[PDB]
Amino acid sequence: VPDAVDWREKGAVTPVKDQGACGSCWAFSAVGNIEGQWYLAGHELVSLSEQQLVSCDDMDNGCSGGLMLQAFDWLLQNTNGHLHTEDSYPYVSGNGYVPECSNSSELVVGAQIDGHVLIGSSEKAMAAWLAKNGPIAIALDASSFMSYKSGVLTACIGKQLNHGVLLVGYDMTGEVPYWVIKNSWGGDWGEQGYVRVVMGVNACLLSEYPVSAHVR
Ligand SMILES: CC(C)C[C@H](NC(=O)c1cc(C(C)(C)C)nn1C)C(=O)N(C)N(C)C#N
Ligand code: NA
């Protein structure tokens, strides 16, 4: 069990994105995880398309919510696991409206998944899984994120799962051990788009729904 893991420094995390007023956290969470699994399977890091899921995934509900596992299922059942690049299928739902799904010939496939896993809902198991396998898509209570600016959150409201984000690392070398979370509220929010949360107390209910795609 390493004292610290940072998948950002290891090259597995793309720049921070901004979901805007759309309830598409589920798509940002899922895509961020896919980006990491894709890189860790030996491919070049590439930013992938949340918009494809928001507009095309009919198991989920666009700007009205979704679930990361359902997003993976939609890809597996409808595109043979293929996801387009962000550059070719950019995010346009920041104002809450969802355009029709595109099948333009200018779309470029950026990645392919072949399965998914639901990781045991235990913080200690998540840390071991993340240390070996990469960033985890999680659900949590983000109520305490509304006022967060910087530092390690040691008091998180843990009442209701109301957001989805990406767990990119942890560090246990200081007095307060912490997880590092990539949010989808733009690079000006929090610590250049990230938040740190204490480990070992199920802070923010972060161990309730840890999931990942699988890449060959
Ligand atoms: C992981 C989970 C907590 C994410 C959460 N999921 C929902 O809210 C949700 C899912 C569904 C169906 C029934 C699956 C279609 N319907 N709603 C309203 C979500 O999407 N959040 C918090 N958004 C808005 C972000 N942004
Ligand atoms: Na900031």
Side-chain angles (χ1 to χ4, degrees):
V1 186
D3 283 8
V5 180
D6 193 339
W7 287 111
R8 297 173 301 178
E9 67 95 346
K10 293 304 182 74
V13 182
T14 64
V16 171
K17 308 181 184 180
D18 192 343
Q19 66 184 87
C22 179
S24 51
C25 63
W26 56 274
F28 286 83
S29 180
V31 168
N33 161 264
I34 293 169
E35 291 169 342
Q37 295 304 291
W38 182 248
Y39 167 80
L40 293 172
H43 307 279
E44 284 195 77
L45 188 71
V46 61
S47 294
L48 301 166
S49 176
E50 289 82 12
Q51 193 67 53
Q52 182 175 2
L53 293 178
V54 174
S55 286
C56 307
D57 172 356
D58 60 354
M59 297 170 170
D60 295 296
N61 200 15
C63 289
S64 299
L67 292 173
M68 292 82 72
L69 287 183
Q70 294 189 348
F72 299 151
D73 283 329
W74 183 86
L75 297 165
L76 292 164
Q77 296 177 30
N78 300 90
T79 66
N80 287 318
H82 293 285
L83 191 51
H84 297 300
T85 66
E86 187 181 23
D87 282 0
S88 81
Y89 202 160
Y91 187 66
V92 300
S93 282
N95 68 10
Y97 168 74
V98 181
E100 188 219 313
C101 180
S102 168
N103 61 75
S104 153
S105 63
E106 290 324 273
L107 295 173
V108 180
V109 175
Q112 183 186 29
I113 64 164
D114 67 8
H116 63 69
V117 290
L118 172 69
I119 293 148
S121 63
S122 150
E123 251 185 302
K124 188 188 186 182
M126 286 165 62
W129 197 95
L130 178 144
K132 182 176 187 174
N133 301 290
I136 301 174
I138 55 160
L140 48 62
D141 191 335
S143 292
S144 290
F145 291 9
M146 304 297 266
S147 55
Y148 173 83
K149 305 296 179 198
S150 65
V152 177
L153 268 175
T154 59
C156 201
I157 295 157
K159 181 61 180 169
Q160 171 194 70
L161 299 177
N162 57 28
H163 195 27
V165 295
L166 183 73
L167 195 56
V168 300
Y170 64 77
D171 189 317
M172 320 197 211
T173 67
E175 285 313 80
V176 181
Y178 61 77
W179 291 107
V180 184
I181 292 165
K182 190 189 191 190
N183 206 348
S184 51
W185 296 350
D188 289 313
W189 180 84
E191 297 178 330
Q192 298 178 88
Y194 290 84
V195 50
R196 290 182 280 172
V197 175
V198 66
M199 302 177 86
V201 293
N202 197 34
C204 324
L205 304 181
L206 64 83
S207 73
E208 297 307 307
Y209 184 69
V211 306
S212 182
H214 188 268
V215 172
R216 182 178 188 167

